[PDB]
């Protein structure tokens, strides 16, 4: 019943080769729904989900402006941060920024975020209460104070507690059908020997949305992680996701190692095994 | 929406 809006920002500096490359993407839950790529031609914010296409010109003009302004800022920062860390103007660097808001089944504000990173490492970020800051190093320490005094939180928070959440609601219902669906995992199992007399056992989860899912292999009263090899949940490109968990097993007791598959959209949790 | 305000590190 939880939901979320989450914007993702990556600008990466191209010394000598023009401006920095700037990629921005928007998400509700685990659907992507808008994007911006500076190298792209249109130089506007773009839809990536049907229910947003609904939105009129001012929305799109608007979102185009703000996201451009996002990069101008990131661009300034890129220099500022060279300064802060004392860095050659000849190296390239990466600034990342993500923020957003979470709501509950009541669609009211739950949580807020706003975090920042230089060269893929924590810099500063907004703390849980949307009022103070956590700086990761000496440089961001500078920025903390300056922001505290500059009243940065006070604004970000009104967005995160308010306009962020207002809209996340607006989206959820205009995207009534895509966003609140609950596609459950199409599971099965496989056998691969390797060995000759042990054998790997592979529990598959497919076509499921959202991406939150648990795959465990077992005792036969309860669990196992000797070799429950598990791979990163991965996208299919149709909006759904995939995962698997695996155990290498002795060859004639395949028949007391089960696999459990918990997920939303499953009424009751699935237990699954190879007879 | 996406932020109307954004600070400078």
């Amino acid at each position: 019943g939880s939901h979320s809006m989450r914007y993702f920002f990556t600008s990466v500096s191209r010394p000598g080769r023009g401006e920095p490359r700037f990629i921005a993407v928007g998400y509700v839950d685990d659907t992507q729904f808008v994007r911006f790529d500076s190298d792209a031609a249109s130089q506007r914010m773009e839809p990536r989900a049907p229910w947003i296409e609904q939105e009129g010109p001012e929305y799109w003009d608007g979102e185009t402006r703000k996201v451009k302004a996002h990069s101008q800022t990131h661009r300034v920062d890129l220099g500022t941060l060279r300064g802060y860390y004392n860095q050659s103007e000849a190296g390239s660097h990466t600034v990342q920024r993500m923020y957003g808001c979470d709501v509950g089944s009541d669609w009211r504000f739950l949580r807020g975020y706003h975090q920042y990173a230089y060269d893929g490492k924590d810099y500063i970020a907004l703390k849980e209460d949307l009022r103070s800051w956590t700086a990761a190093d000496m440089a961001a320490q500078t920025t903390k104070h300056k922001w505290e005094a500059a009243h940065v939180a006070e604004q970000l928070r009104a967005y995160l507690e308010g306009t962020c959440v207002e809209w996340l609601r607006r989206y959820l219902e205009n995207g009534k059908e895509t966003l609140q669906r609950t596609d459950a995992p199409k599971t099965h199992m496989t056998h691969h020997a390797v060995s000759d007399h042990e054998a790997t056992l592979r529990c598959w989860a497919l076509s499921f949305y959202p991406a939150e899912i648990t795959l465990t292999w077992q005792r036969d009263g309860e669990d196992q992680t000797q070799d429950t090899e598990l791979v990163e949940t991965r996208p299919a490109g149709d909006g759904t996701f995939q995962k698997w968990a695996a155990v290498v097993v002795p060859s004639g007791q395949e028949q007391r190692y089960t696999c459990h598959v918990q997920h939303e959209g499953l009424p009751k949790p699935l237990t699954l095994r190879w007879e | 929406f996406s932020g109307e305000y954004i600070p400078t590190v």
Partner: T-cell receptor, first 111, second 117 residues
Framework: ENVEQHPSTLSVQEGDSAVIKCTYS??????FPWYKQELGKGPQLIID?????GEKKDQRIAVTLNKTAKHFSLHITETQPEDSAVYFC???????????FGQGTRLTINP | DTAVSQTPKYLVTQMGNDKSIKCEQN?????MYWYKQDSKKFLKIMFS???????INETVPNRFSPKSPDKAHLNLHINSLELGDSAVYFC???????????????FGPGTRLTVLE
């Protein structure tokens, strides 16, 4: 993309109050400074407003922000002969973005 | 002490000439700016430079050509002159960073320019 400064000129006695009212047309602006330009010289910041605070005051001058209605105002209480100048109000979206100026107001504090 | 300086003070030539204006600040700022203030005191931002990097551009009659060599200097060469360049051009400098924490823009004394037939 627009800011309306009213009035163009304004005369005040050495005692009275002077109020210049400005209207910006953007609504995502969140920074509103006032610039004092003495005599064809370089404009100078007297007072600006960020946070949300619907009133920022410093001694004899004060700013109001009523951002829903899209207007903000400079108040010169306590007028004096030195206060005579051309006053400019501006609005921006903060950060690396452009300030937008009004037509500016020509203030005479008659002594 | 410290300031945003700008030469020449005044300047006067005629149509289709070539003139250049300079400006400098030892305030230690990120950004520098150029504004045109026309006949009726209206200020309009033209260009800006954060660390040699150009941000604001507005519209470029590309006669109008900025140039920012280092953080502290900022010049404007104007080519093939206009009677409508009859304006006062204002260098300025701010400091972006920390918010910007300090928002004020510091103005130079302006370079007055009248161009004649």
């Amino acid at each position: 993309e627009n800011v309306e400064q009213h009035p163009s000129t304004l005369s005040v006695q050495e005692g009275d109050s002077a109020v210049i009212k400005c209207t910006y047309s953007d609504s995502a602006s969140n920074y509103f400074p006032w610039y004092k330009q003495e005599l064809g010289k370089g404009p100078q910041l007297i007072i600006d407003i960020r946070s949300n605070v619907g009133e920022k005051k410093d001694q004899r001058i004060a700013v109001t922000l009523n951002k829903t209605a899209k207007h903000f105002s400079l108040h010169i209480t306590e007028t004096q002969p030195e206060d005579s100048a051309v006053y400019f109000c501006a609005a921006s979206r903060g950060g690396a973005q452009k300030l937008v100026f009004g037509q500016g107001t020509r203030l005479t504090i008659n002594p | 002490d410290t300031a945003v300086s700008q030469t020449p003070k005044y300047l006067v030539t005629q149509m289709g000439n070539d003139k250049s204006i300079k400006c400098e600040q030892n305030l230690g700022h990120d950004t520098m700016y150029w504004y045109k203030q026309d006949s009726k005191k209206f200020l309009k931002i033209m260009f800006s430079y954060n660390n040699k990097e150009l941000i604001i551009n507005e519209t470029v009659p590309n006669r109008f050509s900025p140039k920012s060599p280092d953080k502290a200097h900022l010049n404007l060469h104007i080519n093939s002159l206009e009677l409508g360049d009859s304006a006062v051009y204002f260098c300025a400098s701010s400091q972006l960073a920390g918010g910007p924490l300090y928002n004020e823009q510091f103005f130079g004394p302006g370079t007055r320019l009248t161009v004649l037939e």
